[PDB]
Structure 1
Amino acid sequence: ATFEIVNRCSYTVWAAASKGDAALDAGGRQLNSGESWTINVEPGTNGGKIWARTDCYFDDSGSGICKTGDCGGLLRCKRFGRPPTTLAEFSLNQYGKDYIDISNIKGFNVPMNFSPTTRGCRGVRCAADIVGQCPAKLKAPGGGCNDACTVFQTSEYCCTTGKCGPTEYSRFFKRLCPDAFSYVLDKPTTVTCPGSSNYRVTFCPT
């Protein structure tokens, strides 16, 4: 499957793509404002994620640091990124269908649209100014808006037992972005797409 990753932000981002135990395609790349990078994701990829990283520095070997979404200091991510990270999440060719969503469960750094480029389903978007409106206690000094699990490490926020409810913090993310997951047990906003659809992830869509 192809994923065109487009940076419409006025700032550079370093796109990242991983399924947690491996890179997807090269795993990461710099995207200056306006640039597009198309990756190939293997059919059947389960639990893939794409995200933006901000304020990165990498040496000539591709090792360094980012302020949001850092994946073990690598340009080419093999693992998931450090919160806060707005997440485009997908599982492809699962019993004939693809499943996509956006999640704020690991916080929010950059606004995102995640849409099919092929027929048969809708896209999802979280493009509100979550960083600007972020509750004071969730603001990450390194940049972005942390989720409450990251900040407070409670069973309730982290849904450790599989028994959590919505919270004042989750409701903030949900108010700003109704069509993204705000906590683990949120009413799903996953979209079913035809199996083997292709996609575009746009940072700063609006």
Structure 2
Amino acid sequence: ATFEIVNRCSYTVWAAASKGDAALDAGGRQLNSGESWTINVEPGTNGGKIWARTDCYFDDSGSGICKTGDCGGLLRCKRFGRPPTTLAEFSLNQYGKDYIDISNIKGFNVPMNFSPTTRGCRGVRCAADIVGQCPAKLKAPGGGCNDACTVFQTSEYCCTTGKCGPTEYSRFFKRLCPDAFSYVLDKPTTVTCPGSSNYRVTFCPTA
């Protein structure tokens, strides 16, 4: 599948794409304002994620730090990133269908649009000003708005028992972006698309 990653933000992001134990395509790249990066995602990939990282510094060997979404200090991510990170999530060619979602379960850093470019399903978006409205306890000094699992490390926020309900914190993310996961057992906002669809992820889709 082909994913075109678009940075429409006014600031530079460092895009990332990994399936947790490996990179997708090169794994990461700088995207200045307006740049587009096109990657290929091997068919059948299940549990892939794409995110933005902000405020990064990398040396000439691709080693460094980002303030949000750092993946162990590497430009080219192998693993998932440190919260807060707004996530686009996908599983490809699963019994003939592709599965796509946006999640705030690991917090929010950059607004995002995840839209099929091919025919047969709809996109989803989380575009609100979550960082500006973030409750003070969930604010990340680095930037972003953490999820309450990250911050408070409880069974209820982390949904450790497989039974958990919505919270004052989940409902905050849900009120601002109903079309994204807000906690692990939220009613699904997964979109089912035709198998072997191609995609666009747009950072800061509205500004």
- Computed over aligned residues only, the root mean square deviation of the Cα atoms, in angstroms, reads 0.3
Residue by residue over 1:133-191, the C-alpha shift from the partner in whole angstroms, topping out at 9 and shown as x without a partner, is: 00010000111000000000000000001000000000000000000000000000000
- Work out the CA distance in 2 between the residues paired with 1:131 and 1:16: 20
Structure 2 stretches of 5 or more lacking a match? none
C-alpha deviation, 1:4, in angstroms: 0.2
Residue by residue over 1:75-109, the C-alpha shift from the partner in whole angstroms, topping out at 9 and shown as x without a partner, is: 00000000000000000000000000000000000
Residue by residue over 1:45-88, the C-alpha shift from the partner in whole angstroms, topping out at 9 and shown as x without a partner, is: 00000000000000000000000000000000000000000000
- Secondary structure in structure 1 of the residue aligned to 2:55: coil
C-alpha deviation, 1:117, in angstroms: 0.6
Residue by residue over 1:22-65, the C-alpha shift from the partner in whole angstroms, topping out at 9 and shown as x without a partner, is: 00000000000000000000000000000000000000000000
Moved beyond 6 Å, runs of 4+: none
Structure 1 stretches of 5 or more lacking a match? none
Identity rate of aligned residues, in percent?
A: 100
1:178 equivalent in alignment to 2:171: no
- Work out the CA distance in 1 between the residues paired with 2:123 and 2:99: 11
Count, aligned residues: 206
Question: How do 1:37-186 and structure 2 match up within 5 A?
Answer: 37-186=37-186
- Work out the CA distance in 2 between the residues paired with 1:117 and 1:22: 25
Residue by residue over 1:110-137, the C-alpha shift from the partner in whole angstroms, topping out at 9 and shown as x without a partner, is: 0000010100000000000000000010
- Secondary structure in structure 1 of the residue aligned to 2:156: helix
